[PDB]
Design a protein around this nucleic acid. Structure first.
Ligand code: ZN
Ligand code: ZN
Ligand code: ZN
Ligand code: ZN
Ligand code: ZN
Ligand code: ZN
Lengths: 255, 255, 255, 255, 255, 255
DNA sequence: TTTTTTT
DNA sequence: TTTTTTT
């Protein structure tokens, strides 16, 4: 149990202060690859590195990824604004990998709802790379008032049917003022071998955003990390849910 | 005919006071395997054991398993709070097995609605392990009022279209604030060797929850105990229903 | 034209007083098979036996089977209460068979609406045995008032949107307090043999309740009796209706 | 232009007074075949007979068949009530045949809307014989008021949402109090052999009621008479209509 | 740019005053063929005859056919009322033919929207002759008020959901009170002659009314004149249209 | 970042002032092919030409094609009004081509939203050439007020439910007063020959207007330039969008 | 034109 | 569980 404020700081300290077995501040060397000719938009954090330095925090990103990842991103944000005088940089993703507990798609249960889980499996499908509105800026066509609504890649589009200012039910989505990011859906299912004779390989759908889009093709063995999310089955008539994996970090493996 | 209040107490006694042919308070030994390293969340109760000690009660769990099981669980809850000083432990399932009457899928009818029955048979289907919302929490996006509605794994999702506080018809389900449990659907049919001549084997769909989830695969001979539950089919304006078996306990058998 | 009150009595007398060609009070020997080890829940009345004793009543079960059947059941109810002192016995079905007019599925018309008819044919389909709510006991969740509404196996479910006592539009169906019976749909059509060359058969769908459920399988030649019923052609937006045969008695025949 | 009152009388006179080339009052001989063992429910009037006796009326059943037919039916009702002392007989249909103008399906046009037309053709389909509510008797479940609303076999069911007496919006259809008649749909089209090259065979759907139900099977050459009716195309989005032929009389012909 | 009033007169004059190369007032000779034993309901106007007499008006029927045709019909209405004392005659169609610009189906575009065009082509389809409601009459079933709404054969049906008098949302279309005319759809495409051997022949759908109904079959080489009309595509969401050719005159040609 | 005002001028200058390696004011020779017997309605601008002359502008048409294309068209407008005394000519399209970055259908992403991109691909489909309302003039039928609303070919039809003047909810589109243009949809996908044949090729739909309509058939290898546009997926219960390519120039290529 | 009474 | 961007 650690609140955001301190996490950011602890994360900041982790990044600049962590050193491996050679004195490599590797995370300084990764906050550096953020500012080159071909810049990256995310920082790959090895969980074991975070654990050894501060396991008390490493057991928060797992038990509370929405705050943990978010906080760590504010941390990268700071160690740039301070240690490199860069504020111009867009948003950078905190992508944790190499977790302790490595589940199987069939094992994913309601226990893991909104917890960062790690999953091994094989990709069976990959969708088209489609634009996702990460921030929908609505505009009023009566007074011209602007309304900001952040969206979530697994939740449905959250509109607004009434103006905040003049109360006019004449609101439209302004594509230009809005923020868009690449998005790609994909499915992975436990490899047939790991299972047992009479078992039906079980699959899970997942989401990829920004830089981790188009990183895998059907038939790749992968080890994804990510937040287990839940939603209603299409119809939305019963109290049973759909499991979606909001991927936080994906990494191939040749078995 | 026995109300809850007494059943709780009678169950309490049964648990701590029952002894087999060797003076084993077996249920004290099972209330024990609730507190260990690898804790279980349910007490397997042999019906014959209940019957021999208190057959008037044993004939209530069968005629009224909603009250019956529920009472027994409050019993286990008490014999922990008193005899072990533990109140931290979550909820523990009272799972009855080895009933006297053992039906065959085909003989399951309207007489058994909401009575605990016992069925032997062979699993033909098992669904994905889905999160079920045991207790749903709706949130208003106008006044932020909270409304709690418990759901039932066989009944359809019970929503609320209007705010209890401000009466705003702008309510949404909050996934975090809600409670979830593992859920799995499965089908079983009569063993063919027990049916006669030109009979075609009948089936029945069922539900597993929490600990009993993913305990059986397609092709297993099982003996399930359960509550026979009914609900209206693909419409909602016809007085015909659908038999669903809310399994209370499942146990394998190699014939 | 005979009212219920007198029918009950005339039926009572019929059962106890009727003798065949050997002085067999056959119906006394049948009301007897109701109280045995393996009890039956219906009394199979030959229409010819009723006609010969009282044809003025036998022409009432045909022209008014709702009253006719109902009255004859109160008669079996009384001849048990008086002649055998039994009042514990549940409800017994008066099922008439062997009528004079034996129709063919294609001949069934508007004329027969709500008259007891007799049909020969072949069974083409049989549905699953689902529970039918014969008596919906609605409960208010504001004042706890109880409302009883009998249902009809062909008609749509008749709910109630407002409380009879407090007028609260918060009513629900109570499964337990309600009475359920086994139900099974089935379809019979004309034998394409006695149906002109390269023509086509028009079938009928039928209903079975309680004891007569699961008595036939697809391919059986049967001779059913029953009430011809009618209901709005699926989507209730046209003046045309659908013929349903609420079966009152079914009997096989090997041709 | 002749009003109902007079039409009924002239029709009455026609029936009893008409004598062919042998002094046969044939229509007396057909009002006769109404009262026998195997009674018919319609009088088959040859238009040519009507025309020669009264051609000014025969040019009314064609230009205004809803009045014409109805009037002639009251006339048959009267020439039974006076000349045979029968009033018990139900309703009898005045079915006209053998008109001057014999149309081809493809020729039936807007001109003929609501005129009695004659059409030769080939039956391509016949529907099931369903019950039609010719008179929907609505019953109020608050005051028990009764409301009669006649229905038309091509128009949609006309209900009534409010009580005529107490104004309670709790009205239902009473199956028993209502009048039902046999109904059967069927389609006929010009036959491909009779067409002039590029043209592709056009069909028309029709309605049969009561006695004329189930008179034809698919593949019969027929010469129907009837009232050309119009309705919206299923969707009801465009000002273009569907041609339905309310049959008034049908007669086979072996070519 | 000429307003209606003047056109009517200019047309009136044209009809009675025009003479060819032999002094034939041909149009008088055609307004004549209107009154005969076998009357026609349309006057075929050659555009070249209209052009030579008054080319400033001829260039109005093309640029504004809706006014042009309509004015010319009022003209024919007048030169009957005055010059022949006939007012009983119904409505006569002003059908122009032989225009200067003669398009090819593939050349028909947005330019031509609502301009009278001329198209040569080959008929590939013809629909059934259905009744169109040229003038629809709505009647209120609460106060009985009547509302007239003229329809257009290409646009969708224009209803009215609220009463003009009492404002009751209980309005229906009265078939009888309404006016219907014959209607027939048809398709033509470019005749696969003049059209480079590697083009996919483009086509267009058209509408015929009254007297010009059923004038061509599939496989006819025709020269149509017509108003190019558009309507919102499929969903009526999108700002896209559909080209329909409301024919104003059709004429065969044997190549 | 350059505002419209200046771009117009800079573009004006570019057109009249640019000279190749031969002193050819090529664009003067092209603004010339605008006035001739067979006039074109678009100026085809090589990006490279714009780039060498003014590379700070050429990196605006790409980064801001709405403003950029628009601007250049006002420039073409001016260099006609001044240098040729023509103001009668309609609207001329500025169509850039031969861009530096030439994407592949699968590569097109969120980054390119509203930027002019270049795409090589193979045409797989082409739609019918339907009229598009580029400017919808709405007319009120109560006061006669006119309201201009420009449309976009990919966005849905923007109507107006209320009159600007008298507030009458009785508004209709006036087809005449509106401006229309030919429209044609078409799909292109990467060629799977130049893409590991173990992948499923991905496509993109596009829009063609005016003069670029009907320039390609299915199977053509093309190099389109255009604006990448986004709209929601059919249903619209997702913050996930659909990519459409509003073509700004299309050119064939024989590989 | 509408395509089985219910699937 | 969902089944492709879509007629
Ligand atoms: Zn506003
Ligand atoms: Zn609220
Ligand atoms: Zn109440
Ligand atoms: Zn009433
Ligand atoms: Zn009214
Ligand atoms: Zn207005």
């Amino acid at each position: 149990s650690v609140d955001r404020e301190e996490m950011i700081e602890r994360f900041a300290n982790f990044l600049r202060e962590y050193t491996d077995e050679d004195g490599n501040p590797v995370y300084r060397g990764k906050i550096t690859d953020l500012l080159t000719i071909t810049p990256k938009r995310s920082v790959a954090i090895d969980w074991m590195h975070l654990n050894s330095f501060d396991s008390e925090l490493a057991h928060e990103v797992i038990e509370n990824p929405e705050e943990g990842i978010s906080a760590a991103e504010d941390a990268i944000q700071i160690v740039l604004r301070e240690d490199f005088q860069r504020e111009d940089v867009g948003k950078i993703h905190a992508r944790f990998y190499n977790l302790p507990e490595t589940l199987m798609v069939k094992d994913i249960g309601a226990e893991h709802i909104n917890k960062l889980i790690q999953v091994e499996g094989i990709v069976t499908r990959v969708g088209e790379i489609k634009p996702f509105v990460s921030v929908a800026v609505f505009v009023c066509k009566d007074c011209g008032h602007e309304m900001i609504v952040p969206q979530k890649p697994y939740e449905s589009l959250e509109k607004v049917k009434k103006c905040e200012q003049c109360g006019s039910k004449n609101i439209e989505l302004d594509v230009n003022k809005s923020s868009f990011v690449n998005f790609q859906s994909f499915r992975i299912q436990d490899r047939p071998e790991t299972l047992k004779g009479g078992e039906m390989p079980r699959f899970i759908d997942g989401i990829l955003l920004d830089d981790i889009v188009d990183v895998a093709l059907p038939g790749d063995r992968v080890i994804v990390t990510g937040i287990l999310r839940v939603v209603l089955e299409k119809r939305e008539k019963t109290p049973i849910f759909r499991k979606i994996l909001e991927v936080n970090h994906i990494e191939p493996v040749s078995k």
